[PDB]
Design a protein around this ligand. Structure first.
Ligand SMILES: [K+]
Ligand SMILES: [K+]
Ligand SMILES: [K+]
Ligand SMILES: [K+]
Ligand SMILES: [K+]
Ligand SMILES: [K+]
Ligand SMILES: [K+]
Ligand SMILES: [K+]
Ligand SMILES: [K+]
Ligand SMILES: [K+]
Ligand SMILES: [K+]
Ligand SMILES: [K+]
Ligand SMILES: [K+]
Ligand SMILES: [K+]
Ligand SMILES: [K+]
Ligand SMILES: [K+]
Ligand SMILES: [K+]
Ligand SMILES: [K+]
Ligand SMILES: [K+]
Ligand SMILES: [K+]
Ligand SMILES: [K+]
Ligand SMILES: [K+]
Ligand SMILES: [K+]
Ligand SMILES: [K+]
Ligand SMILES: [K+]
Ligand SMILES: [K+]
Ligand SMILES: [K+]
Ligand SMILES: [K+]
Ligand SMILES: [Mg+2]
Ligand SMILES: [Mg+2]
Ligand SMILES: [Mg+2]
Ligand SMILES: [Mg+2]
Ligand SMILES: [Mg+2]
Ligand SMILES: [Mg+2]
Ligand SMILES: [Mg+2]
Ligand SMILES: [Mg+2]
Ligand SMILES: [Mg+2]
Ligand SMILES: [Mg+2]
Ligand SMILES: [Mg+2]
Ligand SMILES: [Mg+2]
Ligand SMILES: [Mg+2]
Ligand SMILES: [Mg+2]
Ligand SMILES: [Mg+2]
Ligand SMILES: [Mg+2]
Ligand SMILES: [Mg+2]
Ligand SMILES: [Mg+2]
Ligand SMILES: [Mg+2]
Ligand SMILES: [Mg+2]
Ligand SMILES: [Mg+2]
Ligand SMILES: [Mg+2]
Ligand SMILES: [Mg+2]
Ligand SMILES: [Mg+2]
Ligand SMILES: [Mg+2]
Ligand SMILES: [Mg+2]
Ligand SMILES: [Mg+2]
Ligand SMILES: [Mg+2]
Ligand SMILES: [Mg+2]
Ligand SMILES: [Mg+2]
Ligand SMILES: [Mg+2]
Ligand SMILES: [Mg+2]
Ligand SMILES: [Mg+2]
Ligand SMILES: [Mg+2]
Ligand SMILES: [Mg+2]
Ligand SMILES: [Mg+2]
Ligand SMILES: [Mg+2]
Ligand SMILES: [Mg+2]
Ligand SMILES: [Mg+2]
Ligand SMILES: [Mg+2]
Ligand SMILES: [Mg+2]
Ligand SMILES: [Mg+2]
Ligand SMILES: [Mg+2]
Ligand SMILES: [Mg+2]
Ligand SMILES: [Mg+2]
Ligand SMILES: [Mg+2]
Ligand SMILES: [Mg+2]
Ligand SMILES: [Mg+2]
Ligand SMILES: [Mg+2]
Ligand SMILES: [Mg+2]
Ligand SMILES: [Mg+2]
Ligand SMILES: [Mg+2]
Ligand SMILES: [Mg+2]
Ligand SMILES: [Mg+2]
Ligand SMILES: [Mg+2]
Ligand SMILES: [Mg+2]
Ligand SMILES: [Mg+2]
Ligand SMILES: [Mg+2]
Ligand SMILES: [Mg+2]
Ligand SMILES: [Mg+2]
Ligand SMILES: [Mg+2]
Ligand SMILES: [Mg+2]
Ligand SMILES: [Mg+2]
Ligand SMILES: [Mg+2]
Ligand SMILES: [Mg+2]
Ligand SMILES: [Mg+2]
Ligand SMILES: [Mg+2]
Ligand SMILES: [Mg+2]
Ligand SMILES: [Mg+2]
Ligand SMILES: [Mg+2]
Ligand SMILES: [Mg+2]
Ligand SMILES: [Mg+2]
Ligand SMILES: [Mg+2]
Ligand SMILES: [Mg+2]
Ligand SMILES: [Mg+2]
Ligand SMILES: [Mg+2]
Lengths: 51, 48, 78, 64
RNA sequence: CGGCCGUAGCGCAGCGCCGAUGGUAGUGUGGGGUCUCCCCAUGCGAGAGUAGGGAA
RNA sequence: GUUUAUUAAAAACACAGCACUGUGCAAACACGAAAGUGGACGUAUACGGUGUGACGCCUGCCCGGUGCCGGAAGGUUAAUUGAUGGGGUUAGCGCAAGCGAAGCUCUUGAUCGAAGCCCCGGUAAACGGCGUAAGGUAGCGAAAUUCCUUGUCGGGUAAGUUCCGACCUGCACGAAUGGCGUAAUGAUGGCCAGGCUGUCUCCACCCGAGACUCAGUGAAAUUGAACUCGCUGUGAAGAUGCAGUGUACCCGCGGCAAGACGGAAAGACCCCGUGAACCUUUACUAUAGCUUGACACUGAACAUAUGUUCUAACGUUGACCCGUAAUCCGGGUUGCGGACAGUGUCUGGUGGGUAGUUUGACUGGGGCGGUCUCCUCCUAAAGAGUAACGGAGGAGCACGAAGGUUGGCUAAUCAGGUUAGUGCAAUGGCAUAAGCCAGCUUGACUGCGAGCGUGACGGCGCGAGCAGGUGCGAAAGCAGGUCAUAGUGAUCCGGUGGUUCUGAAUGGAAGGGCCAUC
RNA sequence: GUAACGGGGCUAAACCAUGCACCGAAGCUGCGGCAGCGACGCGCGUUGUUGGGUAGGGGAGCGUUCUGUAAGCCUG
RNA sequence: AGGACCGAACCGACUAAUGUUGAAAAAUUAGCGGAUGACUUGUGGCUGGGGGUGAAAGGCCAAUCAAACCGGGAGAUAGCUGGUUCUCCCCGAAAGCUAUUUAGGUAGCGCCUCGUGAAUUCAUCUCCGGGGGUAGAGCACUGUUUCGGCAACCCGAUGCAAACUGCGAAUACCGGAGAAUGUUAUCACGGGAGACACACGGCGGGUGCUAACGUCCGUC
RNA sequence: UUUUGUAUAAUGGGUCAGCGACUUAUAUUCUGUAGCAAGGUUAACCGAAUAGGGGAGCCGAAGGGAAACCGAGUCUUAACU
RNA sequence: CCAUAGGUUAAUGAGGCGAACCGGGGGAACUGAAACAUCUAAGUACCCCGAGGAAAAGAAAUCAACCGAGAUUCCCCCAG
């Protein structure tokens, strides 16, 4: 595929991450989403990082 | 374990775990064993 | 002396799993289908692949209902 | 001579209280991003060896 | 607001729609022929169409 | 001349002659772990290797490819060396958190570094090629080469697929894996004629040896058992043995070979086996050999790591002396080389010279072609499932919105009513839209999961509900990705982050586990 | 080699219809016997029923040589 | 003089016939080639098996050669072929699915057997509750088709379809209830398998020519 | 014998006699049977000892968890309806 | 040159053979992995040297785990 794997890393400093894919060519803007961090047990901002 | 060439069950499944050396030197004693020591004082040497 | 055909997919085992009057436990799949050939009636849920399943213990009931004469599956709580 | 354990089987199966065997599920080593969390969650607990396969496992593990 | 889901809808009986009875087609079982297809006994019996219904 | 002892004597091999090429002598080369030996008691008019094959006339063009030869600017590159950075440990310092010298230690890999390769040239009597490297010259040509083909024309014959002479349309000649000729030679291939004949028309007779009879001696292959006929049919499908029928008194002897799918040899063709062997190569992996450099054996001056000089290691297959009746060997003297050569360990290159092996399956035989996983429809016989090298198409993704939710909206076509739309095949769905537009958003949540579907299994699927935390909505509610069904890869081995679960005397650490992920 | 009713032969001994007789199997029944399984009652009865078999599974036996029983027993 | 010529010995081996359980495991007979040479022959010697030797045929190396012979590893391995020995009694398959460097092998499942345990568990029939999209039919839809009216559309008339459906059976299948019958005929777990080459016939079909004692499914 | 299927014109056997093929050891599981029973049993060895001694061990009476660990529970999870 | 090499004689010993066991120097392949190369077979077969009635090993620069053991060899366990 063209879509590359990325991690979404927790802003809470737990080291918890989600993984997803991204079309980096069309969307170079870094993905940022509020997601559930199960370590702190809260929704916090997650930010794109390299897989 | 040979299945005709199909990846056999003991290879298509993953390995897991490790073996504890501490488990090999740990025992369990039953209540029934407590009367079997000499002198009614149960410790590691009296059980041995 | 060669064919450009020779392909097919695995059969999906769709169709009715529990027929009219059958007693089912909650969760039981009643029909597997593509789209809503059958629609969910009372005490029946529709899954993401249009599987109809029992949401209550009871007897399966097929009915034709409404202005389009569509087929509905219900559970009569029993 | 003594039967030899199939050592690879001993690393994959453990005998349970009523004499079945527990194993770890396949498909949770890699290629994980594409797999649904639900699928992966259900693969995490250990499972029992099926009836059809118990004969093969028992042959491999004579000293289980 | 519902039940019902065209006998209930349109148009202004003209259509849609419903629809027997009888016959026909098919067909389970048994039997038969001249056997690419049929027939007989028995059971089941359409679809289409016909009479009729019908302006919920 | 030589050859397949025992089915091939030849056009094959050899050959004198020719050419290329290596080789300066302790020759190259070969046999040898080595010492040595052959080459040769030879020395470039010599020796080895390769190709061609007397002689005559000759031997054209191509150096792009693969070799070989030469080159060395630049790139790349081994062992070696170990800069620099990051870790572990702990003297100590910190209430602890933590920090942390030295040492030891795990890791990193700057710099150094030869040949090779890339690179730049040359080379075809190198391997080869001859419409782009260059397009086949001379000569020859239906040929030991020509498929079409018995080419066409001429000759020879009454009649000639052969033969001879031509032609050129060379399927697919061609110049030392030589071209074209060529006197002589040949148990060589083809064709014609005279002579000659039982080769033949078409056989006859005769002489001998067997065959036949008698006496003596006395085998063999084969053999389930036999009371062992024809025919037509039947039948594991070609009958002495079955059915029907016909014919046939019992038994030898000489003869003949139509049958007993006669005898002989577990078909050599063909396929199969995850059989074998030997052979090939730019198949894989190795490896002898060859070759590169580093370190060792291995030293000293001087000059600017290279160069000169030196002698004392080391070499000597120069000379001479002695052991000694000895051309081996050793010791000695001396000359010549000389830290080179050479050998050991390590190291890069090269390496069918040699070795071990691999080189799939399906298949209306095998091969060639096609195919191999997944999705949709039909075949499929109104539950599920259902085959063929049956009939038709698609997938190996896309999307932070094209997902969630709230609110709204309704198509094609030219009145109509979904004939449109659906991110992509087909099928089933879809208006309460699942189709179209906009606002706010991250439920494309984490832990679980009653129950069920589908699989031999590994697995795969559907799922209300429970806990936590979240979005949209006034609210009922809806949301654990997308109308659904393709968009995929077990295990091992390892990588990264988290987690003191483990931690081989103890504290740590390494490594392992567990969770997430590649 | 008749060679396309199995043959003889057939004008029905063919074909169609109707009917009644008979033949015909290791089927069924009769008589006698053996064995498996299940009931029902006391290892025996009563009762029902079953018994074709390749691969193959299960059950039960025969006989052979040798050891004990056996310095016994049989045997010039 | 001569790898000169003709021709015995001698060395060969071109042709034919015979022989082919031979006189002979390569000869005999009639002819044939070389016959002073790269000739031939006696005696002795040397070269050894991935090795020799080869005027080169993979020829020859003791009747053996694309790797001699003998002994050993050794009972190599053989998913292949063959064979497998006394008796009686009971039950009794399969030639399928899935996977496989798999296809004539093997594994799980299906089907056999033995044991144990358990529910009216199972079957037939009757009644009741169900979903069908096949046969048939039809032509609104997707396509195809003919005629006519108005060469399109439209209207009327006529057919055709595995991948057409505004219709739609028989059967089959799932579930429920009730008798009767049946040696539990059912299911689970455990010991032991075999089998995974099927054949023909009927019915429904694909393929082939509604050819095949053809081929591929379904079902009896 | 092999097969879908063999009188087969598929295989094997001329005949007779003798010989000729599921064994043995050690592990392991299940069945039967015997002993003892919440226990059972010893190995080497000692013993002249088929005795007797020898309980080193092994199996069983507890599981869950990768593990630390907890324990009729335990694991999962912040926590389980 | 001293010498040393060399030479001669005497004394003492060796040499060769032998079935296994033993120590050492070398060291396959078939085979198994359902192919095969790592791996296996196996330090086996085989070749070679040497010894003895036995050989070898042997008196801790050994283990252990903060308690302790006390050279080597062999047997049963630990444990597939
Ligand atoms: K269900
Ligand atoms: K000749
Ligand atoms: K070149
Ligand atoms: K440090
Ligand atoms: K040619
Ligand atoms: K050449
Ligand atoms: K020439
Ligand atoms: K000639
Ligand atoms: K007859
Ligand atoms: K004959
Ligand atoms: K010198
Ligand atoms: K040097
Ligand atoms: K090579
Ligand atoms: K086929
Ligand atoms: K064929
Ligand atoms: K949205
Ligand atoms: K929630
Ligand atoms: K050899
Ligand atoms: K199987
Ligand atoms: K069983
Ligand atoms: K059939
Ligand atoms: K056969
Ligand atoms: K034969
Ligand atoms: K046993
Ligand atoms: K027992
Ligand atoms: K629990
Ligand atoms: K090997
Ligand atoms: K194998
Ligand atoms: Mg499908
Ligand atoms: Mg409706
Ligand atoms: Mg992981
Ligand atoms: Mg009708
Ligand atoms: Mg000659
Ligand atoms: Mg010959
Ligand atoms: Mg000859
Ligand atoms: Mg020399
Ligand atoms: Mg030549
Ligand atoms: Mg260089
Ligand atoms: Mg020709
Ligand atoms: Mg011609
Ligand atoms: Mg003539
Ligand atoms: Mg002519
Ligand atoms: Mg000519
Ligand atoms: Mg040529
Ligand atoms: Mg040339
Ligand atoms: Mg040339
Ligand atoms: Mg020539
Ligand atoms: Mg006589
Ligand atoms: Mg015949
Ligand atoms: Mg005669
Ligand atoms: Mg004759
Ligand atoms: Mg024959
Ligand atoms: Mg054969
Ligand atoms: Mg090779
Ligand atoms: Mg091998
Ligand atoms: Mg091979
Ligand atoms: Mg094949
Ligand atoms: Mg179906
Ligand atoms: Mg059906
Ligand atoms: Mg089937
Ligand atoms: Mg949406
Ligand atoms: Mg969407
Ligand atoms: Mg979609
Ligand atoms: Mg590994
Ligand atoms: Mg430690
Ligand atoms: Mg330590
Ligand atoms: Mg005639
Ligand atoms: Mg008759
Ligand atoms: Mg009778
Ligand atoms: Mg009878
Ligand atoms: Mg019977
Ligand atoms: Mg029987
Ligand atoms: Mg006796
Ligand atoms: Mg001469
Ligand atoms: Mg000769
Ligand atoms: Mg002669
Ligand atoms: Mg001559
Ligand atoms: Mg002569
Ligand atoms: Mg040849
Ligand atoms: Mg010979
Ligand atoms: Mg060989
Ligand atoms: Mg062996
Ligand atoms: Mg053998
Ligand atoms: Mg029976
Ligand atoms: Mg495979
Ligand atoms: Mg039809
Ligand atoms: Mg098979
Ligand atoms: Mg088959
Ligand atoms: Mg079949
Ligand atoms: Mg048919
Ligand atoms: Mg057939
Ligand atoms: Mg047929
Ligand atoms: Mg056959
Ligand atoms: Mg027969
Ligand atoms: Mg036959
Ligand atoms: Mg015969
Ligand atoms: Mg026969
Ligand atoms: Mg045979
Ligand atoms: Mg025979
Ligand atoms: Mg435990
Ligand atoms: Mg000695
Ligand atoms: Mg192998
Ligand atoms: Mg000693
Ligand atoms: Mg101490």
């Amino acid at each position: 595929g063209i879509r590359e794997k990325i991690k979404l890393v927790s802003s809470a400093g737990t080291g918890h991450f989600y993984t997803t894919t991204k079309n980096k060519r069309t969307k170079p803007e870094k993905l940022e989403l509020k997601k559930f961090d199960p370590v702190v047990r809260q929704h916090v901002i997650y930010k794109e990082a390299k897989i | 374990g040979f299945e005709g060439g199909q990846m056999p069950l003991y290879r298509r499944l993953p390995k897991f775990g490790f073996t504890s050396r501490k488990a090999a030197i740990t025992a369990e004693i039953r209540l029934s064993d407590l009367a079997k020591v000499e002198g009614g004082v149960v410790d590691l040497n009296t059980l041995k | 002396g060669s064919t450009r055909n020779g392909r097919d997919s695995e059969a999906k085992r769709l169709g009715v799993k529990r027929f009219g009057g059958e007693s089912v436990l909650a969760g039981s799949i009643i029909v597997r289908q593509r789209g809503t050939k059958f629609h969910a009636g009372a005490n029946v849920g529709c899954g993401r692949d249009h599987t109809l399943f029992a949401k209550a213990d009871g007897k399966v009931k097929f009915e034709v209902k409404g202005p389009k004469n569509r087929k509905f599956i219900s559970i009569e709580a029993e | 001579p003594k039967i030899k354990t199939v050592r690879g089987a001993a690393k994959r199966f453990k005998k349970t209280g009523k004499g079945g065997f527990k194993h770890k599920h396949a498909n949770l080593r890699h290629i994980l991003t594409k797999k649904a969390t639900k699928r992966k969650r259900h693969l995490r607990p250990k499972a029992m060896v099926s009836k059809g396969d118990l004969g093969l496992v028992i042959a491999c593990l004579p000293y289980a």
